[PDB]
Design a protein around this ligand. Sequence first.
Ligand SMILES: Nc1ccn([C@H]2C[C@H](O)[C@@H](COP(=O)(O)OP(=O)(O)O)O2)c(=O)n1
Ligand SMILES: Nc1ccn([C@H]2C[C@H](O)[C@@H](COP(=O)(O)OP(=O)(O)O)O2)c(=O)n1
Ligand SMILES: Nc1ccn([C@H]2C[C@H](O)[C@@H](COP(=O)(O)OP(=O)(O)O)O2)c(=O)n1
Ligand SMILES: [Mg+2]
Ligand SMILES: [Mg+2]
Ligand SMILES: [Mg+2]
Ligand SMILES: [Mg+2]
Ligand SMILES: [Mg+2]
Ligand SMILES: [Mg+2]
Lengths: 174, 174, 174
Amino acid sequence: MRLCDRDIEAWLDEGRLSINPRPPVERINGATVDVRLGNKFRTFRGHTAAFIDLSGPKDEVSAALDRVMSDEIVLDEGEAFYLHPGELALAVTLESVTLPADLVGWLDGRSSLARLGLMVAVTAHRIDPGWSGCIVLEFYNSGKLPLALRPGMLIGALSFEPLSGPAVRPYNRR
Amino acid sequence: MRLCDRDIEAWLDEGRLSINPRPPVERINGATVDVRLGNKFRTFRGHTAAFIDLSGPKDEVSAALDRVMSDEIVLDEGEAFYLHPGELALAVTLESVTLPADLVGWLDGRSSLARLGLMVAVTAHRIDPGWSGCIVLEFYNSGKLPLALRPGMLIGALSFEPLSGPAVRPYNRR
Amino acid sequence: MRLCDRDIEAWLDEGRLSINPRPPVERINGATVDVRLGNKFRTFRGHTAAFIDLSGPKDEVSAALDRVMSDEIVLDEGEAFYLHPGELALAVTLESVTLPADLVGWLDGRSSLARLGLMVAVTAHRIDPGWSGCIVLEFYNSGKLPLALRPGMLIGALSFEPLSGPAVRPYNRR
Ligand SMILES: Nc1ccn([C@H]2C[C@H](O)[C@@H](COP(=O)(O)OP(=O)(O)O)O2)c(=O)n1
Ligand SMILES: Nc1ccn([C@H]2C[C@H](O)[C@@H](COP(=O)(O)OP(=O)(O)O)O2)c(=O)n1
Ligand SMILES: Nc1ccn([C@H]2C[C@H](O)[C@@H](COP(=O)(O)OP(=O)(O)O)O2)c(=O)n1
Ligand SMILES: [Mg+2]
Ligand SMILES: [Mg+2]
Ligand SMILES: [Mg+2]
Ligand SMILES: [Mg+2]
Ligand SMILES: [Mg+2]
Ligand SMILES: [Mg+2]
């Protein structure tokens, strides 16, 4: 059952849901909180590696993630990151988000951007009970033209769903 | 908490959820209402523009949407729209949908079509409290062959989730 | 309203949700049950067909699915399936899943894999009330390198949502 805008505001006020920085009324509507584009980007540089083995522990999958992804790319004031057709890029939300053990988050991308080819998780839109941090984003340009993204733009929408009870093993405790 | 088929039928009957035209019992099952393909299509013609700037207000993002997308394409009786591999196309549901301030919709594409490469929102599957209208669809052909789509085919599935309370700023009031 | 880990464990214990084989505590966390990669794969071989017509009954859409998809591919011990950039492949979960008429499932892919290009449903992540069986998976490699998948790896995450009441026409009864 999704929280409506007014109840998102309630859970924020009680300190049971945290979002930093806290988005104003303008960005809390219906059943979502708008989220923004951060300033840390990553792209592929595949030439060092033949493939990526996706089986095997987090450490292998994370070691791989860094052997083939570029250095962090931080954009100045003004600057846009251009995501070219058929490219997969990694980014991050501006907002940090902390969920309690009895809420689950869902990130939607924006539909108006999807229509121009911007694909955002997509595969895993779930923010877990106990998640605390920025949300890592994967973009895919499914469109015909390059898409310019600037830090601070609206990039997605969080909605929040109470669980049937507080989770015994939330993200933070494992 | 999703409405089951019987309760979708209830909310339709009370006039608290509206779907036009109203789908018969055949198309209301489990926790979804089947939706159909409309008859308004759009494709990319990128050659006029170098890129699309996705930051900046709706009007810019919508101005862009029309500078680079084709004219509306309306298909006769018989006719199919062929969505070619790697193409992003825009379409619309046959059904209009109106949600009240205390329901949120989710559009799924059909799994049997996804298996042949048909990707449908995907990024933003959320229909908001207060949404009233057709649902704009983005298709992406992730497969190897062209996919023929005909107006009237089943194209997706709506499910409906009550909010924790009626939303203070639903879509219609902003 | 999603079941938390403890309540997923409850519904499993009561025999109201079934997952075979039953995943241990390690794979039931927050609001999800981890699911694994099975051992039945399929790829496209498009050269026999010009297109696929996606309108027309299940039997046509399923006839098509077999005229253009390869034979079942079963991988030995050791073996990896390599999903190459821009390829759409079909697979299956290791676990069989049975839902009752008053629960709906959602499959997420894993975010750490999505970041390396692994796209999993994506378009239809919904497991219906009354669904009983393996879950068919479509993968898409949106990344730059090939991705190696091995049977038994974690491939996704199931979450479960009670309906507003038991569904009158669940999947099994139609
Ligand atoms: N695939 C979709 C998804 C949403 N919509 C509709 C339904 C929603 O109430 C609105 C807003 O969706 P969303 O917030 O993701 O779009 P914006 O880019 O913020 O305008 O558009 C649609 O027409 N087609
Ligand atoms: N990725 C998926 C999604 C759904 N399924 C299963 C689970 C659901 O109960 C059914 C129906 O899903 P869906 O309505 O989207 O598929 P259809 O094209 O209408 O047959 O198939 C699956 O095997 N793999
Ligand atoms: N697009 C996303 C999705 C999830 N996350 C966060 C939120 C979740 O609590 C975690 C776990 O997501 P998930 O189980 O799909 O990822 P793993 O591959 O299992 O580590 O990561 C994210 O940063 N970006
Ligand atoms: Mg919005
Ligand atoms: Mg998602
Ligand atoms: Mg269906
Ligand atoms: Mg979606
Ligand atoms: Mg996980
Ligand atoms: Mg999905």
